[PDB]
Design a protein around this nucleic acid. Sequence first.
DNA 1: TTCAGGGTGGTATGGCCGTAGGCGAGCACAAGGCTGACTTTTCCTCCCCTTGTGCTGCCTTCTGGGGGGGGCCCAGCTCCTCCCCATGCCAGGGTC
DNA 2: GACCCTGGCATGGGGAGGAGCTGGGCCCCCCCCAGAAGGCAGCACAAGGGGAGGAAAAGTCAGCCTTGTGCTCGCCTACGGCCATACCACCCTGAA
Lengths: 88, 89, 91, 91, 90, 90, 79, 79
Amino acid sequence: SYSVYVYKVLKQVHPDTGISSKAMGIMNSFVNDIFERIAGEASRLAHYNKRSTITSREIQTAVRLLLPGELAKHAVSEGTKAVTKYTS
Amino acid sequence: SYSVYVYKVLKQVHPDTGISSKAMGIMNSFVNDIFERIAGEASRLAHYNKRSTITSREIQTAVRLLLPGELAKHAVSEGTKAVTKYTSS
Amino acid sequence: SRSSRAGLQFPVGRVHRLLRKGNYAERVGAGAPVYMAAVLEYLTAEILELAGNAARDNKKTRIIPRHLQLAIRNDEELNKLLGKVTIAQGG
Amino acid sequence: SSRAGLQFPVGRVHRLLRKGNYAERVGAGAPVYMAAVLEYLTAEILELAGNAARDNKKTRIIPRHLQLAIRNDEELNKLLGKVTIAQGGVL
Amino acid sequence: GTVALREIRRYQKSTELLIRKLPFQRLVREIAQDFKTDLRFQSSAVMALQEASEAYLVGLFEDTNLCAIHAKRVTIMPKDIQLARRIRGE
Amino acid sequence: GTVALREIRRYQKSTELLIRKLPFQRLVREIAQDFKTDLRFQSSAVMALQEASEAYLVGLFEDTNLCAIHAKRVTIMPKDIQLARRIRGE
Amino acid sequence: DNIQGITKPAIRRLARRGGVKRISGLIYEETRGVLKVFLENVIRDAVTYTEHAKRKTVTAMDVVYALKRQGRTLYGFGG
Amino acid sequence: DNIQGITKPAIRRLARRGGVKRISGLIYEETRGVLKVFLENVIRDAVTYTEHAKRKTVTAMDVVYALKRQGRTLYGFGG
DNA sequence: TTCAGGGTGGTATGGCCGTAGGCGAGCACAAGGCTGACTTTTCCTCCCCTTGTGCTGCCTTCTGGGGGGGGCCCAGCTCCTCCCCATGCCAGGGTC
DNA sequence: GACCCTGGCATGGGGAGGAGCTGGGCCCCCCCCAGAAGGCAGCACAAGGGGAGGAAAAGTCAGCCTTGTGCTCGCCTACGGCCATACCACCCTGAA
């Protein structure tokens, strides 16, 4: 489901390093796990606030609630850099 | 808040017994937790089987997943009886 | 209405409304509220029949959170079902 | 996702969010944000596991190396604490 | 000799709060001031925190007692607390 | 002593499967016949049940080793297994 | 420094409710840290909820959700 | 009795992977009993999923869901 | 080859300003029930010794798992029907 | 008392069904060799007993500070109203 996309990132941080076809079966179950977690949390934040829109804010608060200390600090910085580049 | 119906159920089973406001608040959180449990499970089943309608079968399977042993057996029998009587009325 | 027609005491209509507005599926059937209401009624009746016996054991009429905690942690199935639940002011 | 300097399918995560029944409406910043978060976690994982595989005189990432990075990184260890990595062993 | 047993019975037949509310509230507000300045609270948020913390410590102490009985002991220790916490995951 | 230490090292450095596949499949089928007669299994379903059960047992034995070390022991025992399971929750 | 607010008699009462028959002299200092980390986790989650709700007053529902996020459902403070 | 196929050498290998240095004589029976409460639960969840799906072949995805709903995720045997 | 993307109408969501009241911070004041310090003892934890019993290291047999090779037929997937279940929306009134 | 639950009506769409079609799960067969299993010698480590010392338990007493009550103030937050634009549904295109 995401096999292509991991290779793209792989070729950046490890240009010479390949990956097994059993390891990519994990990352396809890893992105499927984190995505469902964040989107399962950003969907409960909206229900608390009696809302119906999963905007960029409901994702960020879901990221901080799930990701540990320093994982949640650069994720909400790299992620924040994405929305200010795609919008403008 | 399910206070009225929990009160009615309590007077149905125990005719003379009463209940306090804190116990009522506890039961009205118990019900709102179990309802969300059996609804999240019936949504998981509906998404897994790629269907589009929560029905009696999804609730049945969710009950069998959630409630253990005799609780699930008795609850599933109760629900089957309820929906069987529902169509005649 | 549906509550009386299904031989129940719980709000079939309210359960259906909560299912529909709960975003549990794009569509919701016409038997799921009746099934859910009966399951919840059975669970509540079981707990209120156990807590009633527990409270009458102490010769007390009004049921307090401690009675509910005693019933839940005494009955095995309810104990494992609510095995991660903090019954506030229960003991 | 070239509009936001990413390598993930912003369109695909938008579609998954829309069909996931996670809300009545989905914003136009949630796809980009979640794609960027997914990309950061992916890059962190295949940097730690890449370093691990280099330390094992191998040029290919394998599940043993993936669980050699997740378990040897305390942030990722806490995050994936209830995860059974297939063909991973323990260390 | 019997004081420990009578205290166990007294505190296992009662459901009161065993941490004083004013110091618990001060501790909670001191902890919250490390996150957000001038953050208010409620008369039920602090009570929920107190009930949760007391139930968690009671469970932790029951498991610590199990760890102490394991090591042929009746005195709980930081070793027993650490073993209980490591096994249950924290 | 040295033999046990070398076995520990070898099986900690390795990632293969530790239970034999065909007897595991017979066990899985024996248990599943009670739930549903004349049931069938994808081979990957059994290959996933195995990689779940073996890691579960490895974790349980790690916790049991901690329990045995608690009582100042190197031998792991049924009582240690039960203590680890009680503290975990099962 | 308000961590001494969890005094020795309170920790002893919490232990004696847990069946503990004897308590070491270093249990109190360790239980203080245990309570501190538990409170810090739950309060950080509740403060995150409150900041999301663009509020300045934490609520019992904030605390209940912050506790549900780690497997500890609370019965009673939501009704 | 196909649980006996979970032989003593396999249990010893699992223990040695865990880090165990010496093993008692009843650990084998106790571990067999422990394994046949794990299988008897995950297989029951997977079979009820299969029966809901009107199928008669358990699937890797059925096993993965039965494992994830009891708080034990699996990475690799899906999709 | 179906999925990501450009342009457009519409509207339902959500943002801005008001505001008014509930309730949370905050200051006094005991007071008495609880915590803090001291003393005693006694009972428990830790160290040592011995042992005898159970676990382990090594041999050897044989047995049953693993690696193919092949069949087949049974069940899971696919495509088209269509018709019946559920939904969108307005109005009356029963209940919470 | 008010608001949403049901009744009623019109309607798109989803899933129950009927075939077909083929992938793979089950069954059988053959072999064979590495691992399981039964045994024995040996040892080293778990458990029982004993002694000591020190560190919690238990009682006493003085003090202190939580808290139960009172009252004040002002700030937060829920409700209202209005309106602005963001997102969705739809039609087509072209691309990975």
